[PDB]
DNA sequence: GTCCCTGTTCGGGCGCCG
DNA sequence: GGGCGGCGCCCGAACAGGGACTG
């Protein structure tokens, strides 16, 4: 049937006209499928034969449905989509099984011919014109236009989702205690009723949908667990993902690596310890999606790790609102973090990974704070509740960090977990100059035109040193001078620089950097007992800085 | 009543801003409020054919059971076509009442309603978003006080006649009331203004004291003996401060540093250097010359975290020409929340900026974008929302304004 | 202003769902 | 084999902004 719901008014973008695009040849198999679909849709008023005086056309095609012997009729509406008005998408996110609470009785319903049961704006129907070619000599081929929502139009998803919400509103208002998760036309219906009063409510809901033109065929009416829903298996007290099948390809292209990383990221929602760092780094410079890439031995090892992880069986549990949410975070190297969200010690609600590299220079406390933020937002999305944290960092480390840091930073209620590798600050700059340490006035200068430079230091004990560099910059010369001073100093050193750049970098206590030079500096700083970093205005005649400025600027 | 046609700024399209995740309590309060609002005709459900959207959340006063809906209209306000009691800053006490409900008494121009669209989300995305648009003057829209100004003047004429010593000013949803009465006489007068408001259909930040807001001056250290490091830090501070105070000289203090000395060496100040330090201490007491408020420019507000619950801030319009410099303190070091303190600071600074100039500033926040956007809404208590941006400040500017 | 360096946004692949 | 919308990750390309520089 077709829903008696009022249509959604849609207009073309100002100054635009409907599409005029010739139909491309199609297989006789696909043409037979299209004629079988179209004569049935035309008998039911979902499409109407147009004749002349319809100047528009868009190419159509068909593909086999997901897991059926049925055909899906698609239209390549890309030109019309270019020329159609803008919509505001109402699908704000994707429901997650970990957000489901335990229910007495559960049903899953799929709506039949979902799009084709919702009317389309009568004024807009002209631009949806299409043609079937009917490859035979004896059959001419028929032109149709859509009276319902087409598959391939930009506006069909939002219109269908809003219309389904409209249709479900009365049933929800009459049945507040019955829960209906509504993905596009999938309906998950849970209730605290016994099986038998649940089934009568489900029949009332099916009658409600049928009165609004939406059928719920029995072939997709799931009545007993496990329920197949949103790519998951929902058992009574545990859930899981339908099996992940990683590509076992031998040689790997960019597309193969993207598919591998996507499958691993999808699997990481319930599989702990998934890492995609080296596999993703494999994608850096490649200028085409078809290029073959030799795998790094690091990438091969990481992939084998992920494989062995995926071999194990794992489930998730459902949400209990009367308990606390607990997130626990573990660290791997290379800026990778895994997390588990649960309420009872060894019963995960879900798991996840955070690996974003933010900033040219950072440390593990920054990354841990970013992971806490990410998990907070995700758990607000899924549960509307902020979780309580278990982090591998000591209260002393955190208080030191947010004492020394100049930015505002904070983490919610948390508890130290003694599972290594712990998160720690790897060095702390002194707050006052250290007595007895040698004082290094450092500087660097670079010829902006020829890109040659010098980096050097002058010490208060008489030592002076200048190093010439090529293909360098001012900032690089300053960093190189600080590195030189770290190299030639004892376990305790005072350093005076004129560089806000290098000072701001080193003050933030980084332990990892995408710059090899900063990495060398970090190693030096970790090897030192005490370091004090003072700043002075450049080119002001401040003693010490003036001597190095005169030496480095030959 | 008939509406007032409102247009957008020419060449500008409406706001298209994604709704952000809300907590369970906020979503439930929003559903209650919007249900009771659409039952009264103030808003109407819309669909996806409306291409505009602005985010929505909800706040809840401390020791209160009533939630207040807050629409982030910063973009729409920034795109709406355009349409101050200098004594208010000089009053003894000022109380801030929420008169936004009054705006619901006036219809909104029908051709403009599509621009006020907003979307309520759901926990775990159980349903798509529920979309609404306003039929009346929405709270937090810059046009709401302008369209309503005539009715407000008509309401407040007799109260002003019977109380010419009381200064009452209107910001977006807020009514500020200033008087020189005693703290009890003042509180009884506002109760007269609340009852006066209730008698016309307009239903009515605890208590301000603008004469106690203080300027934080730049200050130099006093010492009995100075090291090379001390003189270097002093010279850096004075070199930076000369951009605000042109009279500051550094030559004499800098002469003490000639040569390559160790940081912890003790340097005795010459009489010339002592004279320079004295005159610089004096120059730091004079206020800044040539700082005039431009109403057509935007107010910039910089904030710096000084540590132990101490924060410095500067309101200016062009760099180094500060309109105001101040500090905000709090209980330090027990269970402080840096983000909560930062939001309290931005609210107090915005309050001062509205009271003084009647305009909110644009905030340069010393915080990461993600941390702020994760937590700032749990501590917000104002009905306006200032525009802001996030900056990775240098530690040098922290050292400059430090105490 | 230019050069350098750094952060943010937005688009394009892939994954998953319908 | 391809058409649509949503969310996720991850990468790069544009663009913006602040600091240091030449004569
Ligand atoms: N690839 C797809 N593109 C789509 O636009 N959809 C949209 C249009 S149909 C709707 C729901 O899809 P579904 O698989 O239930 O197909 P329907 O024809 O609606 O229903 P039935 O096959 O009768 O169960 O989602 C689905 C797809 F799988
Ligand atoms: Mg279906
Ligand atoms: Mg230099």
């Amino acid at each position: 049937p077709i829903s008696p719901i009022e249509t959604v008014p849609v207009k073309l973008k100002p100054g635009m006209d409907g599409p005029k695009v010739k139909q491309w040849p199609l297989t006789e198999e696909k043409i037979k499928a299209l004629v079988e679909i179209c004569t049935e849709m035309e008998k039911e008023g979902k499409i109407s034969k147009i004749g002349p005086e319809n100047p528009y056309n868009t190419p159509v095609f068909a593909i086999k449905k997901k897991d059926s012997t049925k055909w899906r009729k698609l239209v390549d509406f890309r030109e019309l989509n270019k020329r159609t008005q803008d919509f505001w998408e109402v699908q704000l996110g994707i429901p997650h099984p970990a957000g489901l609470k335990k229910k007495k009785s559960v049903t899953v319903l799929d709506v039949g011919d979902a799009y084709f049961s919702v009317p389309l704006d009568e004024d807009f129907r002209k631009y949806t014109a299409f043609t079937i070619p009917s490859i035979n000599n004896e059959t001419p081929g028929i032109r149709y236009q859509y009276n319902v929502l087409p598959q391939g139009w930009k506006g069909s998803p939002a219109i269908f989702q809003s219309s389904m919400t409209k249709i479900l509103e009365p049933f929800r208002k009459q049945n507040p205690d019955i829960v209906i998760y509504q993905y596009m036309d999938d309906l998950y219906v849970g209730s605290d009723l016994e099986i038998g009063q649940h089934r009568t409510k489900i029949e009332e809901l099916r009658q409600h949908l049928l009165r609004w033109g939406l059928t719920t065929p029995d072939k997709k009416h799931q009545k007993e667990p496990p329920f197949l829903w949103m790519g998951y298996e929902l058992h009574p007290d545990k859930w899981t993902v339908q099996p992940i099948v990683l590509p076992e390809k031998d040689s790997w292209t960019v597309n193969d690596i993207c598919k591998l990383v996507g499958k691993l990221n999808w699997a990481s929602q319930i599989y702990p310890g998934i890492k995609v760092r080296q596999l993703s780094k494999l994608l850096r410079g490649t200028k085409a999606l078809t290029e073959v890439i030799p795998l790094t031995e690091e990438a091969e090892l990481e992939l084998a790790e992920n494989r062995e992880i995926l071999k194990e069986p794992v489930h998730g549990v459902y949400y209990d609102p009367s308990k606390d949410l607990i997130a626990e975070i573990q660290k791997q190297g290379q800026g990778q973090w895994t997390y588990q969200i649960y309420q009872e010690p060894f019963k995960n609600l879900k798991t996840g990974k955070y690996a974003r590299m933010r900033g040219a220079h950072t440390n593990d406390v920054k990354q841990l704070t970013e992971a806490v933020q990410k998990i907070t937002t995700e758990s607000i999305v899924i549960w509307g509740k902020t979780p309580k944290f278990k982090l591998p960092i000591q209260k002393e480390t955190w208080e030191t960090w947010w004492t020394e840091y100049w930015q505002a930073t904070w983490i919610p209620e948390w508890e130290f977990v003694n599972t290594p590798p712990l998160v720690k600050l790897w060095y702390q700059l002194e707050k006052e100059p250290i007595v007895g340490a040698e004082t290094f006035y450092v500087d660097g200068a670079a010829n902006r035109e020829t890109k040659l430079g010098k980096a050097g230091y002058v010490t208060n004990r008489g030592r002076q040193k200048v190093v010439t560099l090529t293909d360098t910059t001012n900032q690089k010369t300053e960093l190189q001078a600080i590195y030189l001073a770290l190299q030639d100093s004892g376990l305790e050193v005072n350093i005076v620089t004129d560089s806000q750049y290098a000072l701001g970098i080193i003050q933030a206590q980084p332990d990892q950097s995408e710059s090899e030079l900063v990495n060398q500096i970090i190693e030096q700083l970790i090897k030192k007992e005490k370091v004090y970093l003072a700043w002075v205005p450049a080119h002001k005649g401040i003693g010490g800085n003036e001597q190095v400025d005169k030496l480095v600027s030959a | 009543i008939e509406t007032v046609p409102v247009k957008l700024k020419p060449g500008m399209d409406g706001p298209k801003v994604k709704q952000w995740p809300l907590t369970e309590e906020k979503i439930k309060a929003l559903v209650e409020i919007c249900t009771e609002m659409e039952k009264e005709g103030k808003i109407s459900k819309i669909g996806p054919e409306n291409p505009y959207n602005t985010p929505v959340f909800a706040i809840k006063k401390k020791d209160s059971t009533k939630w207040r809906k807050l629409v982030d209209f910063r973009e729409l306000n920034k795109r709406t076509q355009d349409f101050h009691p200098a004594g208010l800053k000089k009053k003894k006490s000022v109380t801030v009442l929420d008169v936004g409900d009054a705006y619901f008494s006036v219809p909104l121009d029908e051709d403009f309603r599509k621009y006020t669209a907003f979307t309520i989300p759901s926990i775990n995305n159980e349903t798509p978003g529920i979309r609404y648009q306003y039929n009346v003057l929405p709270q937090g829209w810059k046009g709401s006080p302008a369209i309503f100004q005539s009715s407000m003047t008509k309401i407040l004429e007799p109260f002003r006649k019977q109380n010419p010593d009381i200064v009452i000013y209107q910001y977006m949803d807020d009514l500020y009331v200033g008087s020189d009465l005693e703290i009890g006489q003042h509180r009884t007068k506002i109760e007269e203004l609340r009852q006066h408001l209730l008698r016309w259909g307009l239903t009515t930040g605890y208590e301000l004291h603008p004469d106690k807001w203080t300027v934080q001056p730049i200050v130099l250290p006093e010492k009995d003996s100075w090291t090379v490091n001390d003189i270097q830090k002093l010279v850096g501070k004075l070199n930076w401060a000369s951009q605000i105070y042109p009279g500051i000289k550094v030559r004499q203090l800098s002469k003490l540093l000639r040569g390559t000395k160790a940081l912890t060496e003790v340097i005795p100040l010459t009489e010339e250097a002592e004279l320079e330090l004295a005159e610089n201490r004096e120059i730091l007491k004079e206020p800044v010359h040539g700082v005039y408020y431009d109403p057509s420019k935007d107010l910039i507000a910089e904030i710096q975290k000084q540590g132990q619950g101490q924060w410095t801030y500067q309101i200016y319009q062009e760099p180094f020409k500060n309109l105001k410099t101040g500090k905000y303190a709090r209980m330090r070091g027990a269970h402080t929340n840096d983000v909560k303190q930062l939001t309290e600071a931005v609210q107090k600074i915005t309050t001062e900026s509205i009271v003084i100039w009647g305009k909110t500033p644009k905030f340069k926040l010393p915080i990461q974008k993600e941390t702020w956007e994760t937590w700032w809404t749990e501590y917000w208590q104002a009905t306006w929302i200032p525009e802001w941006e996030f900056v990775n400040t240098p530690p040098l500017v922290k050292l400059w304004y430090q105490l």
Side-chain angles (χ1 to χ4, degrees), chain A residues 63 65 72 74 110-116 151-152 157 184-185 217 220:
Chain A
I63 73 184
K65 282 227 187 73
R72 174 174 280 109
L74 292 316
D110 194 81
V111 182
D113 287 338
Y115 279 21
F116 297 166
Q151 292 174 106
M184 173 87 60
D185 60 337
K220 298 197 188 178

Side-chain angles (χ1 to χ4, degrees), chain B residues 5-6 8 10-35:
Chain B
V6 197
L8 286 176
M12 284 188 164
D13 191 18
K16 304 174 173 175
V17 183
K18 305 255 282 262
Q19 172 73 38
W20 59 62
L22 304 172
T23 58
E24 189 172 58
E25 48 170 35
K26 289 177 178 176
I27 294 183
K28 298 319 175 188
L30 281 174
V31 169
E32 298 179 23
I33 295 174
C34 286
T35 289

Side-chain angles (χ1 to χ4, degrees), chain A residues 49-52 55-63 65 67 71-134 136-137 140-176 178-203 205-218 220-247 250-258 260-280 282-286 288 290-291 293-297 299-324:
Chain A
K49 302 169 188 166
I50 52 184
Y56 309 108
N57 194 85
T58 40
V60 293
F61 57 103
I63 73 184
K65 282 227 187 73
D67 265 353
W71 282 95
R72 174 174 280 109
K73 168 187 195 294
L74 292 316
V75 189
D76 187 359
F77 268 132
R78 275 182 286 176
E79 195 57 43
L80 180 57
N81 293 340
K82 289 172 186 175
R83 300 162 186 256
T84 308
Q85 61 158 92
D86 294 323
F87 302 86
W88 188 261
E89 311 298 330
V90 295
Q91 189 70 50
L92 312 187
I94 312 306
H96 199 275
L100 305 164
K101 309 163 184 186
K102 266 107 182 184
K103 292 275 137 179
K104 248 279 189 185
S105 302
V106 172
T107 305
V108 183
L109 300 174
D110 194 81
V111 182
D113 287 338
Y115 279 21
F116 297 166
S117 291
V118 178
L120 173 68
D121 187 325
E122 178 167 344
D123 281 318
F124 202 83
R125 291 168 177 170
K126 312 194 303 293
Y127 318 120
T128 55
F130 66 99
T131 48
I132 292 195
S134 83
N136 280 34
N137 297 338
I142 310 96
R143 310 193 49 209
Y144 296 99
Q145 103 182 359
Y146 267 91
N147 310 321
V148 289
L149 289 176
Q151 292 174 106
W153 184 38
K154 159 214 293 181
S156 293
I159 285 174
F160 184 86
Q161 292 151 357
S162 184
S163 299
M164 175 78 72
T165 300
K166 245 86 170 184
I167 290 176
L168 287 174
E169 214 274 353
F171 187 90
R172 287 202 175 100
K173 288 288 167 292
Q174 199 199 331
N175 300 276
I178 284 154
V179 171
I180 310 182
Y181 269 77
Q182 171 206 331
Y183 205 71
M184 173 87 60
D185 60 337
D186 266 4
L187 300 179
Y188 168 100
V189 185
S191 72
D192 300 307
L193 313 166
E194 299 217 333
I195 305 170
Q197 197 188 1
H198 173 83
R199 297 193 187 276
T200 58
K201 280 295 177 184
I202 294 295
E203 280 309 302
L205 173 61
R206 293 180 59 185
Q207 179 72 215
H208 181 85
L209 295 167
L210 187 89
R211 120 86 165 146
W212 289 107
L214 301 186
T215 67
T216 44
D218 223 76
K220 298 197 188 178
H221 184 167
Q222 310 190 52
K223 297 173 184 182
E224 293 192 10
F227 297 91
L228 282 74
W229 174 81
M230 294 299 293
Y232 306 94
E233 318 194 281
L234 312 178
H235 299 90
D237 276 318
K238 57 165 183 158
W239 63 270
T240 194
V241 188
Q242 276 148 55
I244 320 298
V245 189
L246 286 189
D250 208 348
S251 65
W252 298 81
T253 77
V254 174
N255 191 84
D256 289 359
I257 297 301
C258 283
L260 179 57
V261 172
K263 263 177 167 55
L264 285 174
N265 275 326
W266 163 259
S268 73
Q269 67 180 300
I270 197 173
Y271 279 90
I274 302 300
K275 305 180 227 169
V276 299
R277 166 98 304 123
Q278 307 302 319
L279 297 170
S280 295
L282 233 58
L283 298 146
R284 284 308 162 103
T286 66
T290 69
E291 309 189 61
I293 305 171
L295 256 62
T296 312
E297 49 176 319
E300 286 183 348
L301 289 173
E302 176 178 49
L303 174 57
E305 295 187 49
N306 286 310
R307 245 149 203 174
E308 278 307 310
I309 292 179
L310 283 188
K311 289 180 180 174
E312 301 302 313
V314 59
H315 57 78
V317 302
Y318 299 115
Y319 176 58
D320 185 12
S322 58
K323 291 178 172 49
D324 276 318

Side-chain angles (χ1 to χ4, degrees), chain B residues 10-35 37-38 40-61 63-65 67-80 82-89 92-153 155-156 158-160 163-180 184-186 188-198 200-201 205 207-221 223-248 250 252-263:
Chain B
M12 284 188 164
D13 191 18
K16 304 174 173 175
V17 183
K18 305 255 282 262
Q19 172 73 38
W20 59 62
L22 304 172
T23 58
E24 189 172 58
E25 48 170 35
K26 289 177 178 176
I27 294 183
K28 298 319 175 188
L30 281 174
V31 169
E32 298 179 23
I33 295 174
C34 286
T35 289
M37 279 186 72
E38 85 158 311
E40 295 161 9
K42 303 170 177 174
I43 54 167
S44 293
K45 300 212 181 190
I46 57 184
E49 78 281 13
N50 187 323
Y52 310 104
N53 196 89
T54 56
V56 158
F57 64 117
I59 61 174
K60 177 190 176 187
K61 309 296 177 176
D63 221 359
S64 164
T65 44
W67 287 76
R68 166 77 150 76
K69 164 192 178 188
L70 191 43
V71 192
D72 183 6
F73 271 130
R74 279 179 288 185
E75 216 62 24
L76 176 59
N77 288 343
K78 198 182 310 165
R79 305 165 191 266
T80 304
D82 314 309
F83 299 85
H84 178 78
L88 174 66
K89 47 168 169 284
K92 272 193 176 185
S93 305
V94 179
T95 304
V96 195
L97 299 88
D98 188 4
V99 300
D101 183 68
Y103 300 155
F104 298 154
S105 72
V106 168
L108 178 63
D109 180 65
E110 191 176 21
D111 272 356
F112 198 83
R113 300 196 171 123
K114 73 192 80 184
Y115 296 140
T116 70
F118 64 94
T119 307
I120 307 185
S122 70
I123 314 290
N124 196 33
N125 297 285
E126 189 195 295
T127 77
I130 311 299
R131 283 174 59 70
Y132 293 94
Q133 85 178 18
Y134 268 89
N135 301 319
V136 299
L137 300 182
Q139 298 180 290
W141 179 53
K142 110 178 183 181
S144 292
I147 307 287
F148 194 80
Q149 181 156 92
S150 55
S151 306
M152 188 63 81
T153 306
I155 295 163
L156 299 172
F159 193 90
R160 287 195 180 98
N163 294 315
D165 291 339
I166 289 181
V167 179
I168 44 185
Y169 167 67
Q170 183 182 205
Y171 203 66
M172 296 266 175
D173 300 359
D174 296 349
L175 213 59
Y176 299 82
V177 184
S179 77
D180 293 326
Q185 303 280 355
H186 180 73
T188 49
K189 264 289 173 285
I190 292 135
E191 186 52 44
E192 294 181 8
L193 191 48
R194 292 176 64 189
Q195 281 278 270
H196 199 149
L197 260 58
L198 302 187
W200 181 258
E207 272 160 23
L208 264 39
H209 303 106
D211 61 80
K212 299 182 191 61
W213 301 344
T214 171
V215 193
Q216 180 54 48
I218 297 184
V219 59
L220 297 184
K223 278 182 169 59
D224 290 0
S225 65
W226 303 70
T227 74
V228 173
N229 182 259
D230 292 334
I231 308 299
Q232 286 181 356
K233 295 212 281 206
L234 182 65
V235 162
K237 196 181 202 161
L238 292 166
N239 190 52
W240 170 87
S242 61
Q243 300 177 294
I244 303 175
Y245 295 89
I248 295 182
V250 172
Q252 295 300 327
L253 277 164
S254 187
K255 273 195 60 170
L256 302 161
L257 298 183
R258 288 211 172 107
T260 306
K261 299 178 174 302
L263 288 194

Side-chain angles (χ1 to χ4, degrees), chain A residues 8-10 85-88 90-101 158-159 161-162 165-166 169 172 179-183 356 358 366 369-370 372-373 376-377 380-386 399 402-403 405-412 432-437 439 441 458-460 494-496 500 503-504 507 532 534-537 540-544 547, chain B residues 13 15-19 21-25 35 38 45-54 119-131 227-230 232-233 235-237 239 254 257-264 304-309 311 333-339 342 365-372 374-375 378-379 391-396 398 400:
Chain A
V8 171
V10 289
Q85 61 158 92
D86 294 323
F87 302 86
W88 188 261
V90 295
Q91 189 70 50
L92 312 187
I94 312 306
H96 199 275
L100 305 164
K101 309 163 184 186
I159 285 174
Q161 292 151 357
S162 184
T165 300
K166 245 86 170 184
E169 214 274 353
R172 287 202 175 100
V179 171
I180 310 182
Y181 269 77
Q182 171 206 331
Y183 205 71
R356 255 204 72 173
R358 299 185 49 88
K366 307 248 230 70
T369 306
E370 299 170 357
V372 171
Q373 266 128 45
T376 296
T377 298
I380 290 180
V381 158
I382 291 172
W383 300 289
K385 182 181 190 299
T386 292
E399 287 220 315
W402 87 268
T403 288
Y405 207 26
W406 56 88
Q407 302 269 108
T409 183
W410 178 76
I411 285 183
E432 301 283 24
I434 44 192
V435 179
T439 303
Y441 298 91
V458 157
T459 75
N460 73 289
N494 296 301
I495 302 182
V496 172
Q500 299 194 1
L503 173 70
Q507 275 263 302
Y532 180 77
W535 177 90
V536 290
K540 297 250 70 178
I542 285 155
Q547 325 302 318
Chain B
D13 191 18
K16 304 174 173 175
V17 183
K18 305 255 282 262
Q19 172 73 38
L22 304 172
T23 58
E24 189 172 58
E25 48 170 35
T35 289
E38 85 158 311
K45 300 212 181 190
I46 57 184
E49 78 281 13
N50 187 323
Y52 310 104
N53 196 89
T54 56
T119 307
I120 307 185
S122 70
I123 314 290
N124 196 33
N125 297 285
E126 189 195 295
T127 77
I130 311 299
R131 283 174 59 70
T227 74
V228 173
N229 182 259
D230 292 334
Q232 286 181 356
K233 295 212 281 206
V235 162
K237 196 181 202 161
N239 190 52
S254 187
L257 298 183
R258 288 211 172 107
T260 306
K261 299 178 174 302
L263 288 194
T264 55
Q304 303 94 29
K305 167 187 178 184
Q306 292 295 343
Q308 231 199 343
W311 308 79
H335 284 264
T336 50
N337 189 321
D338 264 0
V339 176
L342 190 50
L365 299 181
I367 191 173
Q368 180 189 114
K369 187 183 200 287
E370 278 71 10
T371 310
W372 176 268
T374 295
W375 281 292
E378 310 297 326
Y379 317 112
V391 60
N392 307 115
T393 59
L396 292 192
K398 183 252 277 288
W400 303 147

